[PDB]
Amino acid sequence: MKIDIHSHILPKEWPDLKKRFGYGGWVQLQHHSKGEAKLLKDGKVFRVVRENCWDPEVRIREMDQKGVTVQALSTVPVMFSYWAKPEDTLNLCQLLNNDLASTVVSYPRRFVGLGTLPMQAPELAVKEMERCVKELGFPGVQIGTHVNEWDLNAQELFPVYAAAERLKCSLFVHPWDMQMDGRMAKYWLPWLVGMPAETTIAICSMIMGGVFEKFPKLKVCFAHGGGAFPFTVGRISHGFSMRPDLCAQDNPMNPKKYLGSFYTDALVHDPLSLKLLTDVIGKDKVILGTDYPFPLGELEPGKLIESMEEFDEETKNKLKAGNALAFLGLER
């Protein structure tokens, strides 16, 4: 109920992409009757969205009802398209990034921009990042938990991290691209269970991969309370200690030592989980996030943090806003 770090938005419309680029599997927007719209596989449909998902005035109203001062805006993670030709992803990223920037120009004290980047091609990613920060004025970028077969430990990605750290650019890591078929096709598991596992893998990849060691000024936030990590850190840490041969031939420091070194969003739904999240990650490093406007997110942003009779007013305020300005390097 002050700043929402995790909020997704799309342009009203965009070019046909199977044409602009050639090949398929790209995602499009079809509005049938104003108020509602549909997201489409190329093949068959995969999400029914509302007016809030593209219309910034609709967004501000809802934000006024809900007490939300600013939303950090990123794209819908399905847009990442790390799987496609690189130069084509650079294109889409420019389109999405300029629309995002355009939305911030209309309401520069209600919105900020988290850019997107062609991560599968590190040096283009670097350039599109100098641009996001220095021309567009974005305070960070949103990226995926893994990039194809690369995980966030990859050496191929170190140039990007170096750049993030150079240009003071924050990173919001969003899980995406779980397994959808076979055992995971029922009960909404890729979302309910697959997303948290992707985030947990991402935190590990980075800690054990050397990233936080080789870039101590990097600002990283993970989605969904960082998945399973706050709860399974004990196991990850003890395992690092038992098999230094499987786990440390890349960075020798125990994962427990980077508690304090990264942020997570507070989208965990339960008070007991929120409490644990703050005891493990820290009161300074947890950030309110809503996943607005999707049904799986928090419906009353901050309602859970406000109900925590054990936090004091200072702590509730780091959670609703204070920690988020730190992470993005902004001022009130």
Is the Cβ–Cβ distance between 117 and 130 less than 8 Å? no
Number of H helices, E strands in the chain: 13, 13
Q: Is residue 4 a contact point for Zn ion (CB under 5 A)? A: no
Tokens of 60: 């501000």
Nearer CB in complex with Zn ion: 175/230: 175
Strands (E), the chain: 3-8, 28-30, 36-40, 47-50, 70-74, 111-115, 140-144, 146-147, 150-151, 170-174, 220-222, 263-265, 286-287
Residues sharing a CB contact under 8 Å with residue 126, sequence separation 6 or more, in sequence order: 159, 160, 163
Site size for its own copies (CB under 8 A): 52
Nearer CB in complex with its own copies: 14/158: 158
Is the Cβ–Cβ distance between 72 and 6 less than 8 Å? yes
**Sign of torsion over alpha carbons 139, 215, 194, 272:** negative
Least gap, CB of 291 to Zn ion (angstroms): 4
Nearer CB in complex with Zn ion: 91/97: 97
CA distance 229 to 279: 13
Instruction: Name the residue among 72, 151, 330, 138 with its Cα closest to residue 117.
Output: 138
Distances (CA, A) of 307 to 5, 64, 275, 304: 20, 20, 11, 5
Among 12-20, 50-58, 112-120, 204-212, which window interacts with its own copies (CB under 8 A)? 204-212
Least gap, CB of 6 to Zn ion (angstroms): 6
x/- letters, 251..280, toward its own copies (CB under 8 A)? -----------------xxx-xx--x--xx
**Residue in this structure with the two tokens 């062609």, named with its chain if needed:** 118
Residues sharing a CB contact under 8 Å with residue 12, sequence separation 6 or more, in sequence order: 29, 54, 55
The only residue of 22, 108, 234, 252 in contact with its own copies, by rule CB under 8 A? 234
Q: Is residue 183 a contact point for its own copies (CB under 8 A)? A: yes
According to the annotation, is 291 in a ligand binding site?
Answer: yes
Least gap, CB of 275 to its own copies (angstroms): 8
Nearer CB in complex with its own copies: 13/279: 279
Partner that binds at residue 233, options Zn ion, its own copies, none, CB closer than 5 to 8 Å by kind: its own copies
Q: What residues between 41 and 80 interact with Zn ion by CB under 5 A?
A: none
Q: What residues between 274 and 313 interact with Zn ion by CB under 5 A?
A: 291
Q: Is residue 189 a contact point for its own copies (CB under 8 A)? A: yes
Nearer CB in complex with its own copies: 107/191: 191
Q: Is residue 96 a contact point for its own copies (CB under 8 A)? A: no
The only residue of 193, 308, 325, 326 in contact with its own copies, by rule CB under 8 A? 193
Is the Cβ–Cβ distance between 164 and 262 less than 8 Å? no
x/- letters, 277..306, toward its own copies (CB under 8 A)? --xx--------------xx----------
DSSP bridge partners of 104 = none
According to the annotation, is 61 in a ligand binding site?
Answer: no
Distances (CA, A) of 323 to 73, 221, 286: 17, 11, 7
Distances (CA, A) of 246 to 202, 205, 228, 252, 310: 17, 13, 21, 11, 40
Q: Which residues bind Zn ion (CB under 5 A)?
A: 291
Binding-site residues from annotation for Zn(2+) = 6, 8, 174, 291
Q: Which residues bind its own copies (CB under 8 A)?
A: 146, 149, 151, 153, 182-183, 186-189, 191-194, 196-197, 200-201, 204-205, 208-209, 224-225, 227-228, 230-240, 242-243, 246-247, 250, 268-270, 272-273, 276, 279-280, 295-296
